[PDB]
Amino acid sequence: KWHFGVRCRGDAPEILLAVYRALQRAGAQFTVPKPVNGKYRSDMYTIKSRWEIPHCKREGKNTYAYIELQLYEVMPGCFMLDVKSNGYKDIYSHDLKSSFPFLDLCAMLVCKLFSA
Amino acid sequence: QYSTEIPAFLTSNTLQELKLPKPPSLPPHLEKCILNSNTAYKEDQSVLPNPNHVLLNHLAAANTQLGVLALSATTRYHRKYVTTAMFKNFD
Amino acid sequence: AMDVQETQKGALKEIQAFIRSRTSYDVLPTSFRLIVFDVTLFVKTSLSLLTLNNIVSAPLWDSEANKFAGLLTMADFVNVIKYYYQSSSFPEAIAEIDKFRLLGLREVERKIGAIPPETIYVHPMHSLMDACLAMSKSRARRIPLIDVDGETGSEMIVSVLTQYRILKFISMNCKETAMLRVPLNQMTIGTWSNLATASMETKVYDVIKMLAEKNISAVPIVNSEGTLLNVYESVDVMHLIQDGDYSNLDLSVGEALLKRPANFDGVHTCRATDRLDGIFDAIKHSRVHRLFVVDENLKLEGILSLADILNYIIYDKDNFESAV
Ligand SMILES: Nc1ncnc2c1ncn2[C@@H]1O[C@H](COP(=O)(O)OP(=O)(O)O)[C@@H](O)[C@H]1O
Ligand SMILES: Nc1ncnc2c1ncn2[C@@H]1O[C@H](COP(=O)(O)OP(=O)(O)O)[C@@H](O)[C@H]1O
């Protein structure tokens, strides 16, 4: 029953679109493809996002969460959208890796992918 | 370099179209999730095997039939591993 | 130092020293699962999730703040039921529970007196002694290990430590358990009078009132002659209410004990002449939650509980039930 990421079906860039819009609805910010003169490079399905962490926003602390997404073709027509955590960093100083708020954010994202 | 706006070309739209690249195929290690392992209720049902330090912090998901979201990630706490499994509403 | 009760005396000394020198971290397996619920989950859902995952408890997450939001245990249910039975002139009022989200169950409890005001837990890198003192200061039978990620201020629920898993840890790690050779009836340990007991004829809600009133986790069932037959645990209450049938509470104990899945840690017994050395061994290899002390003919004499044992080693020589 447990599996990495979330399943997707249909058209590869159709799914890329939905993920992008879903980020936009969460208020995450994201990298974007850049072609090779032409000409879109397969790494377009590698998205680095940055998320303002709400409970820190509530204090008014500028602490961010870094989340990388990656699409993989699984069968033809089936995809895993893989989500991984690059950690959290506040704009200040001065060494735990909690799954939170990373898991609370994947929760948000998944709500956006579905309410679409 | 971050950004707030939807790339334009993903609205052209959108069949036609570039005939753009595929994403890479699924690598063999995301085929298996250690949560599917309960060798351990003999007798401590919380024990998992050691994870694989590539897959620390990758979200995994699961069907509940209960109308909530099942999420989890694995992380190192000092020198031990905690896979947390979150059950959460949608609203 | 060189005879029973002087050898035990010294043996206990090493065991507490062992306890202080370890951390809660140390008790944990090197790779394990932790299940966590959102505080806003509905009560029915959370009950379905305990059973389905085969657990009796779960730490709650308050996800908007990123803060630990309490510990969910069968005690929460036992306390609300007691309250309704003692206060409501309306037997079907208990059904109301199902509408609550865990957060609103916890408010009812808060309002009702059933919960401490601030919120018991320890750092996993502090001493294991810290965990015991707390679990015995409040009579909680499990405790969250909570750390804080200083990059976010968010809390990190590392694990929940039970009394059972502390004792198992001690059983597997301390050679000196084998030197506790003093029979129970010589030491001062366990309860030996005023036992809350019940029979098959007894009604479940009466058993639940006993559990809440004496802050006990279980109640022995005896026959007319007082031979030990079985037990009714606060975890047993979970199996009656799991389908929303809050009228299963009017069942006799016997009827309700038939609805029990095999699964069941069993009932453990010792004679009064038994010593702690054998019990740590029972613990080493099996899931004991308590020992009923009985005679030749299985007649109940008293109860030796996990708190009882922990308390005996860690210390130098009507209302409400705690986290279960
Ligand atoms: N919230 C939880 N998440 C994951 N596993 C749990 C949880 N609660 C209990 N368990 C597991 O269930 C099994 C039974 O434990 P439990 O009945 O809770 O107490 P004990 O530690 O006395 O066995 C143990 O293997 C324990 O690790
Ligand atoms: N049926 C009972 N009657 C009287 N005292 C009890 C009973 N069961 C346990 N106790 C005592 O009350 C305290 C509660 O211990 P606890 O760990 O809750 O018991 P258990 O978990 O075995 O039900 C302990 O001192 C224990 O010895």
Could you tell me the residue ranges of all domains in chain C? 1-181, 182-324
Please enumerate in sequence order all residues whose Cβ is within 8 A of that of B11, keeping only pairs 6 or more positions apart, or say none: A17
Best mutation site among C234, C270, C293, C305 for ligand 2, i.e. most ligand atoms within 8 A of its Cβ?
C305
Whether B83 sits inside 8 A of C31 (CB atoms) is: yes
- Cβ burial of C287 (10 Å; 0-12, 13-18, 19+) is middle
Architecture per CATH, domain C182-324, reads as Roll (3.10)
Give the position of tokens 């509403």: B89
DSSP class of residue B34?
Answer: G
The separation between the first and the last C-alpha atoms of chain B, rounded to the nearest angstrom, is 32
| Nearest residue, CB atoms, A29 vs list B2, B33, B71 | B2
Q: Which residue in chain B is spatially nearest to A113 when comparing CA positions?
A: B90
Give the position of tokens 């799991």: C242
Residue C35 and residue C144 in contact, taking contact as beta carbons nearer than 8 Å: no
Q: What's the CA gap between C157 and B65, in Å, rounded?
A: 26
CB contacts, 8 Å: B52 with chain C: none
For C148-226, where are the alpha helices, taking DSSP H only?
163-173, 204-213
Indicate the resolution in Å: 2.7
Phi, psi of B46 (to 5 degrees): -90, -20
A42 Cα to the center of ligand 1, angstroms: 45
Long-range contacts made by residues B37-46, C-beta under 8 angstroms, separation at least 24?
B41/C54, B43/C286, B43/C287, B44/C29, B44/C32, B45/C33, B45/C54, B46/C29, B46/C32, B46/C33, B46/C34
For chain C, where are the alpha helices, taking DSSP H only?
7-21, 43-52, 74-87, 102-112, 128-137, 163-173, 204-213, 234-240, 253-257, 276-285, 306-314
Q: Look at the alpha carbons of C309, C314, C316, C319 in this order and tell me if their dihedral is positive or negative.
A: negative
Residue C321 and residue C216 in contact, taking contact as beta carbons nearer than 8 Å: yes
User: Which of C151, C158, C159 is best to mutate for the A interface (most A CBs within 10 A)?
Assistant: C151
Task: Determine how many CB atoms are found less than 10 A away from the CB of residue B27.
Answer: 10
DSSP A10-70: S-HHHHHHHHHHHHHHHT-EE-----SSSS--GGGGEEEEEEE-HHHHHHT--EEEEEEEE
* C-alpha C242 chain-centroid distance: 19
Q: Look at the alpha carbons of C235, C240, C246, C250 in this order and tell me if their dihedral is positive or negative.
A: negative
Whether B84 sits inside 8 A of C54 (CB atoms) is: no
The separation between the first and the last C-alpha atoms of chain A, rounded to the nearest angstrom, is 24
CATH numbers and ranges of domains, chain A: 1-116 (3.30.310.80)
C197, C200, C223: which is closest to C211 by C-alpha? C197
Regarding the beta carbon of C218 and ligand 2, being less than 6 Å apart is answered yes
Q: What's the CA gap between C67 and B31, in Å, rounded?
A: 33
State the method: X-ray
Q: Does C40 touch chain A (CB under 8 A)?
A: no
Written as six digits, the tokens of C50 are 């305990």
Task: Measure in Å the smallest separation between the Cα of B2 and chain C Cα atoms.
Answer: 21
The three-class DSSP label of residue C136 is: helix
What's the topology of domain C1-181?
Answer: CBS-domain (3.10.580)
